Design a protein around this ligand. Structure first.
Ligand SMILES: Cc1cn([C@H]2C[C@H](O)[C@@H](COP(=O)(O)OP(=O)(O)O[C@@H]3C[C@@H](O)[C@H](O)[C@@H](C)C3)O2)c(=O)[nH]c1=O
Ligand SMILES: Cc1cn([C@H]2C[C@H](O)[C@@H](COP(=O)(O)OP(=O)(O)O[C@@H]3C[C@@H](O)[C@H](O)[C@@H](C)C3)O2)c(=O)[nH]c1=O
Lengths: 370, 379
């Protein structure tokens, strides 16, 4: 069958959907994936046919409205405006290539709208362990004109929710879902021996994710690397190649640039990040403790669940003393790695993406979730 | 578990292994794939961790032997088999130094190799781990094993072996109607396309009112640079009321665009465009042949040597293709008219598509790979 995947404005949203999209292609289905114009090379390099569904300028809707608790409301309205700006290209593509099913990420609201316009089932796939649905009332408010055309009062419930959240981190209030084993599918490069080999010292990976807006604030990574000086540890910076250069001149002896996280994370004692959900999943999957230094965003609450479970530490304040002490604890106290391995085991026990493709087939053949 | 995939010197060898490698990654395994240095961007753009296992200069082994002496170009099918076994055998020998360096730091539990990725057989034996051979097309690549075993006698002698060892498992993608009767026993697999991707444009997935003919010479730079092959074939289709599209490397396309007014030329993901085509015209490329058969599209094979000619003749004998005997414009235009006009060719191609579809999925084959490693205690 024809399956349309709808990703968003950041590389992690492509990476989060690539296992289910490649699992569907491997089952013989015709799969296309769409995203913002500058995310198209990430889709193509994940080995998926790539569609541009919005110009890169649509990120202006993060600081502007359609006329020209707060974090939840803001994200719902931002992703809503991004969904609204993606409809023209999605309608043009689907008039020529009509999908039998549409799969969208957590906040890829245009997937919900195009599926309803086509009269085909809509599948929502969680792109992290955060509550995929917390931003829906704000998104429904933003998309009231598109929803009104379909005679809808709010975003419609998906025909199926595919969740990757392990049971120990899943809230009591979480909607029913087809569970799935999350697997990494991040951007790849030519591997160098340091990426898959470790030395005698513990290895600390520091990252601020794959969004250019976050990665450009190099002071965040520079400060975190400086905080680890007292530790006898090797520090590796995983960041965009476009911003790495500036970091290389400022920090001699520290590797900085794109390193496939799935390759290097199993060599790390600690993963230090900005509260990025897909980086959090990569660490949990490899049984690696993590240090979360929240820089706002909508994953902070879900990151606190990982900390409460004991597979991480969320620092109360970004101070050098708090960062170095937490890193020492994550390396030194074996309970953190023990809890991370328990989360890895929970993820491993969930249905494989190949098995979830069977649920999608059954859904389209009107056998399942009827 | 850790699984090492070993591809070869052309992008099609990467594409042929990408479904099983991605299916193993999707099952939670740690998967690395290695190839010659200039094939590394194709592995990385298939979304797989990429290793360079040989310098691009290793391709000198197609024209020189290990003693540095010139190698005669094959002139017969028997000579083509011998030549390919020795050429791939030499490339395997030249890949061992880097494979030994990588596997000393990252020890795979299993090694998967393509049809003639003989270094996969050698590194698996050196590591004492199971070796899986995956067919990269419907051709009988095992027929080059005696010539490859002769070439690799020094590496085999070190392991106390008299010939290349039998794989622990052979994974074959050849549909039953095209599979020869003593093919070795195999775990069958449904082949799926995994070719290099690009930003899609509407012409790629939409068709016009005229039949669409796709012409290609594959993904090897050495063969793609001979643009006269594609130019001649496009000129042969002038009398047909048809849209002609050239699928070729971006690096060689401009020449074809200036020489052929109104004809699109460049990299187009074959899996996307082939379902819009009435005919696929090619040089006897096995992965292009599988892409056409999978989509139920008739094909015109214009053999240019190589080890797929005999397998291409089986597709022609089945009736899902025409192999031209004489490469004249008259033969090419007549065969194209027949492939478009006679519906029997497309119905045979659809029968081959149905046979491929009935085979075990790559996700199911990953289970067979796990079973080889999991049952090691019981031999
Ligand atoms: C810089 C860098 C990144 N990556 C990958 C790892 C991961 O797959 C992704 C980074 O995602 P992350 O969770 O760090 O955050 P972000 O890039 O900001 O993604 C946003 C925010 C997340 O909280 C949410 O889960 C994403 C879907 C979108 O990019 C690599 O593999 N190597 C690298 O060097
Ligand atoms: C030029 C071009 C190529 N491709 C893909 C299609 C196919 O996956 C591959 C081309 O492979 P093909 O079977 O045409 O032949 P070749 O590139 O010469 O590969 C050699 C010879 C084959 O007979 C053998 O099956 C391969 C494993 C190696 O590249 C595309 O998707 N789009 C393109 O525009």
């Amino acid at each position: 069958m024809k399956i349309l995947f709808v990703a968003s404005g950041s590389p992690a949203t492509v990476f989060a959907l690539a296992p289910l999209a490649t699992a569907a292609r491997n089952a013989g289905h015709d799969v296309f994936m769409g995203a913002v114009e500058d995310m198209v090379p990430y889709i193509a390099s994940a080995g998926i046919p790539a569609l541009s569904i919005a110009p890169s300028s649509i990120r202006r809707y993060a600081t502007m409205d359609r006329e020209g608790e707060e974090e939840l409301d803001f994200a719902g309205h931002w992703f809503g405006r991004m969904a609204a700006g993606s409809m023209d290209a999605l309608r043009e593509v689907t008039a020529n290539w009509r999908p039998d099913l549409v799969v969208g990420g957590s906040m890829s609201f245009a997937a919900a709208l195009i599926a309803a316009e086509l009269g085909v089932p809509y599948v929502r796939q969680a792109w992290d362990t955060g509550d995929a649905w917390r931003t829906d009332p704000a998104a429904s408010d933003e998309l009231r004109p598109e929803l009104r055309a379909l005679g809808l009062d709010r975003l419609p419930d998906p025909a199926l929710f595919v969740d990757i959240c392990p049971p120990s981190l899943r809230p009591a209030t979480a909607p029913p879902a087809q569970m799935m084993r999350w697997v990494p599918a991040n951007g790849q490069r030519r591997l160098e021996p340091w990426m898959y080999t470790k030395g005698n010292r513990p290895r600390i990976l520091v990252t601020s994710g794959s969004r250019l807006v976050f990665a450009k604030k190099t002071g965040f990574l520079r400060g975190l690397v400086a905080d680890m000086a007292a530790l006898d540890a090797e520090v590796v910076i995983a960041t965009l190649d476009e911003v790495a250069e500036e970091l290389r001149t400022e920090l001699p002896g520290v590797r900085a640039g794109w390193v496939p996280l799935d390759v290097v994370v199993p060599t790390c004692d600690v993963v230090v990040h900005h509260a990025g959900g897909v980086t959090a999943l990569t660490a949990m999957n490899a049984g690696v403790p993590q240090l979360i230094v929240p820089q706002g965003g909508n994953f902070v609450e879900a990151g606190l669940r990982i900390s409460d479970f004991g597979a991480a530490i969320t620092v109360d304040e970004n101070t050098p003393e708090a960062v170095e002490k937490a890193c020492g604890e994550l390396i030194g106290n074996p309970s953190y790695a023990e809890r991370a391995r328990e989360l890895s085991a929970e993820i491993a026990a969930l249905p494989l993406p190949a098995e979830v493709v069977g649920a999608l087939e059954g859904l389209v053949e009107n056998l399942y979730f009827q």
